[PDB]
């Protein structure tokens, strides 16, 4: 199907406790494959997936050098942002950045991304055209003016249409055992009485990859959107994900309730009911 590659970066300042901590991770779809942490003993980018281990030592040296350079630029940017927002030097602040590409089944570019956030708020983003910017405020307009002057979007566009797509295709081939395998969810329905009058039906989905999934409860064929408790999809820790959806039903009406499961690994959407 479709695929994505993303690099996430976070710098967090800590006045009086040294220089900002910098952590970056890279993902293909929902699979972590590289990491870098400036607080590590001897900071290097390290493999986190079997299929990336085969890259040569040149790959790791160049990747490590890019990470270290980003860490230094983030440190200067954090200093800059204090000025843009007329802030004290006493508090801890956050700079986040994501970039990457999406490709379709034919491996052709669907769209690229490059976005920043300051203190958890949208700051500046590359537009879908890969040539213009959207600045969130007057501070970010100064950054936009700088980036426009230095032809930043042009270099980004070249990366996103070129190496991002080409290396994502390479990663998909080298890790095709796992990256191109969808593990369907294992499903079951549980029943927990809460009183004499009502009970909780919980629809479970376990052991699935990728994370994207739809779990819905229906009563007499209508979606129980407003009365469904739906927890965030969560990682099991072995590559797979988990999710459940619960509904409170009047006792004796359990059979009117059906759980519906949509996942990429399933040829047909599943319909489940509780079995006493």
């Amino acid at each position: 199907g479709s695929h994505s590659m993303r690099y996430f970066h976070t710098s967090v300042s800590r006045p009086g406790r040294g220089e900002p901590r910098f952590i970056t991770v890279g993902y293909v779809d929902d699979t972590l494959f590289v990491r870098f942490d400036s607080d590590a003993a001897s900071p290097r980018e390290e493999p986190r997936a079997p299929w990336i281990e085969q890259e040569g030592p040149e790959y790791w040296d160049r990747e490590t050098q890019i990470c270290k350079a980003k860490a230094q630029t983030d440190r200067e940017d954090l200093r800059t942002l204090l000025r843009y927002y007329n802030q004290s030097e006493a508090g801890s602040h956050t700079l986040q950045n994501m970039y990457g590409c999406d490709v379709g089944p034919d491996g052709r570019l669907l769209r690229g991304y490059h976005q920043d956030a300051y203190d958890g708020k949208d700051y500046i983003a590359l537009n879908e055209d890969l040539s213009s910017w959207t600045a969130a405020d007057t501070a970010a307009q100064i950054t936009q003016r700088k980036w426009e002057a230095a032809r930043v979007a042009e270099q980004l566009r070249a990366y996103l249409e070129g190496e991002c797509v080409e290396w994502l295709r390479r990663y998909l081939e080298n890790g095709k055992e796992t990256l191109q395998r969808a593990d369907p969810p294992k499903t079951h329905v549980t029943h927990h009485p809460i009183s004499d009058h009502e009970a909780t039906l919980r629809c479970w989905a376990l052991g699935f990859y990728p994370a994207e999934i739809t779990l819905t409860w229906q009563r007499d064929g209508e979606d129980q959107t407003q009365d469904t408790e739906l927890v965030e999809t969560r990682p099991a820790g072995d590559r797979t994900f988990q999710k459940w959806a619960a509904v409170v039903v009047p006792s004796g009406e359990e059979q009117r309730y059906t759980c519906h499961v949509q996942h990429e690994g399933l040829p047909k959407p599943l319909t489940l009911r509780w079995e006493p």
């Binding site: 990747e63 890019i66 990470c67 350079a69 700079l95 980036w147 230095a150 930043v152 270099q155 991002c164």
Partner: peptide
């Protein structure tokens, strides 16, 4: 593979 920008995109 990561994007090589060499600090040119300072905020």
């Amino acid at each position: 593979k990561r994007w090589i920008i060499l600090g040119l995109n300072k905020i």
